[PDB]
Scaffold this active site. Structure first.
Site, PDB file in Angstrom:
ATOM      1  N   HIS A  43       1.547  38.538 -12.069  1.00  0.00           N
ATOM      2  CA  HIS A  43       0.878  39.548 -12.259  1.00  0.00           C
ATOM      3  C   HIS A  43      -0.679  39.700 -12.020  1.00  0.00           C
ATOM      4  O   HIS A  43      -1.152  40.960 -11.916  1.00  0.00           O
ATOM      5  CB  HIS A  43       0.966  40.129 -13.847  1.00  0.00           C
ATOM      6  N   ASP A  99       7.093  35.161 -14.047  1.00  0.00           N
ATOM      7  CA  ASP A  99       5.876  35.567 -13.721  1.00  0.00           C
ATOM      8  C   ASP A  99       5.042  34.244 -13.202  1.00  0.00           C
ATOM      9  O   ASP A  99       4.134  33.336 -13.730  1.00  0.00           O
ATOM     10  CB  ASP A  99       4.961  35.905 -14.949  1.00  0.00           C
ATOM     11  N   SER A 205      -5.340  34.859 -18.030  1.00  0.00           N
ATOM     12  CA  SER A 205      -4.027  34.613 -17.487  1.00  0.00           C
ATOM     13  C   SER A 205      -3.973  33.889 -16.174  1.00  0.00           C
ATOM     14  O   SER A 205      -4.805  33.785 -15.543  1.00  0.00           O
ATOM     15  CB  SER A 205      -3.312  36.030 -17.803  1.00  0.00           C
TER      16      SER A 205
END
Lengths: 255, 29
Positions: A43, A99, A205
């Site tokens: 992402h 992911d 992240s």
């Protein structure tokens, strides 16, 4: 990192910062698994709803002693990328399942006291380390507090942040949310009746969730920071991409 | 790969970081 403390110098030699080239800005975290290979979250590069889709031309990666608020030049390496490999079956649409992304550096980097890869779990290592209650460690340069509204005050780490967080049992993870969790993700953090806090936030992240092995004295990357609803909210846990599950895709890519 | 996850400033130096014991404690718990 929310509720974390300042990282000691050299604490995470595999830490990587994924930057926007111009205007320069931190977009996510990453980890160094070889001298050419960088592991991060899909992402962080591709999220279609936000018209997001970076190329190796708009990204740079910084490695080494940054101890933020400066271009540590001597103890820090800036690198261009050569290629990006985003897992084929990544699902941005529903729950950001699978992911994971691989970034291949333009050139092999020169390791040091501040640059050094982390290990990838193996069948048995995962087997002994992945249990509820066992504590992992998250590191990042993201916000110290949930900037939902704006929360412009503070939230800017001048030193890398660490937080050790426990793994939470799967059924608890699932009952904490109305979102579908696949075996490709695990969750971690403190339960309400535990008193302690800590979570990863915006800018963390893609970064590593690592665990130290007592069998060999080595650090293994067990997860990648993927998502969560807010940061450090009560009754909620952060979700991580289960590195060991997709250990096979990472192998096909480098072979 | 190979010599991965051994930090030049801790493992390699026989030095345990500030928060390391907390992880171990969680193991033998």
């Amino acid at each position: 990192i929310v509720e974390g403390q300042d990282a000691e110098v050299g604490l995470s030699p595999w830490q990587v910062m994924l930057f926007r080239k111009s205007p320069q800005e931190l977009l996510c975290g990453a980890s160094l698994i070889s001298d050419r290979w960088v592991l991060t979250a899909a992402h962080c590069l591709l999220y279609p709803p936000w018209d997001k889709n970076f190329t190796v031309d708009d990204l740079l990666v910084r490695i080494g002693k940054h101890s933020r608020t400066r271009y540590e030049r001597k103890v820090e390496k800036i690198s261009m990328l050569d290629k990006i490999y985003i897992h084929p079956r990544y699902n941005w649409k529903e729950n950001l399942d699978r992911d994971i992304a691989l970034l291949k550096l333009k050139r092999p980097i020169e390791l040091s006291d501040y640059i050094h890869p982390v290990c990838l779990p193996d069948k048995q290592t995962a087997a002994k380390l992945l249990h509820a209650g066992f504590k992992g460690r998250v590191t990042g340069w993201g916000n110290r507090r949930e900037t939902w509204t704006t929360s412009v005050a503070e939230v800017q780490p001048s030193v890398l942040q660490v937080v050790n967080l426990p793994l939470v049992e799967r059924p608890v993870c699932k009952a904490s949310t109305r979102i579908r969790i696949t075996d490709n993700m695990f969750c971690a953090g403190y339960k309400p009746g535990e008193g302690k806090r800590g979570d990863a936030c915006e800018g963390d992240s893609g970064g590593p969730f690592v665990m130290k092995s007592p069998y060999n004295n080595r650090w293994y990357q067990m997860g990648i920071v993927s998502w969560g609803e807010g940061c450090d909210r009560d009754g909620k846990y952060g979700f991580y991409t289960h590195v060991f599950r997709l250990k096979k895709w990472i192998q096909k890519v480098i072979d | 790969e190979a010599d991965c996850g051994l930090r030049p400033l801790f493992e390699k130096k026989q030095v345990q970081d500030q928060t390391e014991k907390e992880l171990f404690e969680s193991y033998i718990e």
